[PDB]
Design a protein around this ligand. Structure first.
Ligand SMILES: [Hg+2]
Ligand SMILES: [Hg+2]
Ligand SMILES: [Hg+2]
Lengths: 328, 328, 133, 328
């Protein structure tokens, strides 16, 4: 009758027995290239122009469009939760501030700079990173100063971006993360900060790896999902140009690239960015119950830390600061 | 008044201008380390014991529990769609086949072997891969032959697995993908196929990288999500032990690891596995509309091809064979 | 006979202890001898003893000799930078799952070599009493 | 009864037997990547402005604040002991020489230059290295020319440092070891020596690795103890900028870094610096008897030679020249 056949073995090789390095729950911490702390988490901020704002955005989000008079409450707790950083996103809502060169950009009286002067004073502890891009303050809305009903005017847009970059940096911001992807914009932003004699205080945190996928909003210069080589050349370039740290985004779908980042940009702190897409994708997935949020959140995030990142820009920040406090 | 400041530039470096390598839609194909064909796609099969079965499973799935008498219809189309491979998953449903050594495993009259004799004859074209594990044919259900109300009895379980492995391979299956993760199970499965004088016909496609996360079913030997080093040692070992190809899973959350795979196991065809979790996560996410399925499906899949894989095991197989036929 | 360590014996004897601890309920075993091949054996023993998969062999791959253990057998020279690399690479091969470098502060370079060489193995630093006091 | 269990062995692998390479006392010299000679030892000098000085400093020291008229006695013996080099440290003690730009620095009639003209003549044998920094000759005392009640004015301070650097080098000094850590100060010091047409005679011995720790004096630009990446970038930079040799300090607590130094800066003679902290720490430790000085001194120093250094700047110089003469 059908009986269970058992082949005849050889003595076990000592080089086939790894399993004892990972058995206890503690040895699974002792195997992590790096353990996740609170001081890694960087929270994005979307500071709106109506200083009374606190407008919820969404696709799955629990993210908002706050105003400068709400800031001392939304930020208060989180900080007491141990929060050490934020990445400001300015939101002009007034009827006439856009334009042909995103002039309203470096605007001493806008969301961004009127946000950065608010923290440096009510929350001196925090560490301010400022996204640097002309997308949002321009009529066409493209990221950069454009030509005749076409294609971005590099040198202009750059000359214009480096301008903003420094004003933030003059205003009191610690870091500047250019999010354009317009060639050589870094060489210039670093040069500018130099003349502006701020080189030694501001942390250029480039977005060396900004790809294009359905993960930013459902459906200009921006690297192809399959182009694995540009991304290596695009890092190596920004490293050369002065970048002090770099950003990879999206993240979870590009851990390999984040991986390349670490090798290539070995001596530069690497940062992972959990784009909103990913974010609202996880919540959306947790609601139908395809997985339990909390579970998938750390796995996905240690994915950052294993894959290469010693920093992270995520919306699950409100959440982790709670969690990382826990033991059993 | 607040005017748009524009810093003073330097001439553009020729080494800051990559952008022209990726502008046309075609150069974004010319940048892909590898383009996605139909012959890459490997379809998993869950062949049930009731030869009249075609039971839908689910969390978000469009996957089933077919029987040997349904097979000539479900498979028919897909194949005419160009399908070249499948990875069989046997499903015993009879009331008394489990047991202390998953005996019913290599069972000449079960789902698996009664499936593999069905294809080799009605669809000689296909390429049969057979998952090899004792999880499903055991009373406790663990993957392996266990001790006294504890921990897996390695050498036994292995001796037992290698047994099955060969019976499939004797039965007419082209490939065997061990899914245990019990040390040295490969050295043995290769040795067995050798004595059994089948070494030269069967493709050992190990699962060198099987991690543990909430992506297989919501909530034994299995590597830690953060353990990036075991996974490198766990590949290098299986490569040494005879493995002819390897499997990384899950995939999208481990592209970095898949990336390590390619480096380490450079001369071995690497395969990406889109676990059900990922799968039902994408559908679930597409329904709420957080993204459009078709979009996220190829990005996520070229993620495989960029990250390293020249093969793929996914449930979106029914789908891609359609799609890859398309142009505009 | 009023001399030099009897390797194979001592090893046969050490591997013995190693396993008893491991049978007794201990999670890890850090051999501190430095008698050649004592690891291959301690791993083999734990294997037959069918404990391979539960116990973490944390070798002392790098135990040097200096005035830092008590003011003033087999043990690597302070200047021998090459043995220490060969002594790690060996223990890694022999089954060690993690390794120990000691003393530490005076051998950060060696600890540094450790990381490169034994990249996929969790490395541990030991602040010897000497350093400590 | 409890009996001594002895497991059953396998024949000894020839690749587990290293022990015979290190048994005799001589093979422990034959294993040293480099053996410690007297011509490696570089003695620091703190030449005070009162040419009658010979003031003892301290925390544990046996180091002083000599004057130009004491020099021919303190130096005499040591040299006859085989001493081949010294690193001059000038000490202005007069009531009004400090200032806003450490003008008194390159001062043809100060400690330093009035020391360097003393040796080149009474001890032509010696090899003079001159620390180059504005710390000590400035009112605020910071190392560099500062701004408005803040942060160092780079380009100025540099322009000023390169100035001194050359005057020493014009005065008759063989080597110049900049100890600032103000970016690009090397490119400039090398350029200056070039115009000054001294490039080919002066040895730029940078302090590429000057970290910050409680080891310089118990408790400006200076690298973080944990920043392992800056230090690699900070070397690679100075190597590029003209540095002919480099300095790592402190030493014993940074052997890893010294180790990186050797790899990175492989073709440049590397030098180890036993900071006073380390120094007074060893004596202090020897007095309580936690160890015997002489013992800990060579171990710690061969730590330099193994770890990477073919040179050393230590206060135990008076001591080693004695010792290295010995045999049994
Ligand atoms: Hg933008
Ligand atoms: Hg299984
Ligand atoms: Hg200084």
């Amino acid at each position: 009758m059908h009986t269970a056949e058992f082949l005849e073995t050889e003595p076990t090789e000592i080089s086939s027995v790894l399993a004892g390095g990972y058995n206890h729950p503690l040895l699974r911490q002792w195997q992590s290239e790096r353990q996740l702390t609170k001081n890694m988490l960087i929270f994005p901020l979307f500071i709106s122009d109506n200083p009374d704002d606190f407008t919820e955005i969404d696709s799955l989000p629990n993210i908002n469009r706050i105003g400068v008079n709400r800031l001392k409450d939304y930020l208060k707790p989180l900080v007491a939760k141990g929060l050490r950083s934020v990445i400001l996103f300015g939101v002009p809502l007034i009827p006439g501030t856009k334009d042909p060169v995103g002039t309203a950009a470096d605007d001493p009286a806008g969301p961004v700079i009127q946000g950065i002067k608010f923290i440096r004073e009510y929350f001196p502890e925090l560490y301010i990173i400022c996204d640097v891009c002309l997308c949002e303050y321009t009529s066409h809305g493209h990221c950069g100063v454009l030509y005749d009903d076409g294609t971005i005017n590099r040198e202009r847009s750059v000359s214009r971006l480096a301008a903003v970059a420094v004003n933030y940096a003059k205003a009191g911001a610690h870091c500047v993360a250019p999010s354009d992807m317009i060639d050589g914009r870094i060489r210039d932003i670093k040069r500018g900060l130099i003349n502006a004699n701020l080189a030694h205080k501001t942390f250029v945190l480039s977005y060396a790896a900004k790809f294009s996928g359905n993960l930013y909003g459902p459906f200009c210069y921006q690297l192809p999902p399959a182009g694995r080589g540009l991304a290596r050349r695009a890092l190596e370039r920004d490293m050369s140009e002065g970048a002090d740290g770099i950003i990879v985004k999206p993240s979870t779908f590009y851990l390999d690239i984040m991986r390349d980042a670490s090798e290539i940009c070995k001596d530069l702190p690497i940062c992972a960015y959990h784009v909103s897409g990913e974010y609202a994708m996880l919540h959306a997935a947790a609601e139908k119950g395809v997985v339990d949020l909390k579970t998938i959140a750390f796995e996905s995030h240690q994915g950052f830390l294993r894959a290469g990142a010693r920093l992270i820009i995520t919306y699950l920040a409100p959440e982790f600061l709670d969690w990382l406090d826990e033991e059993n």
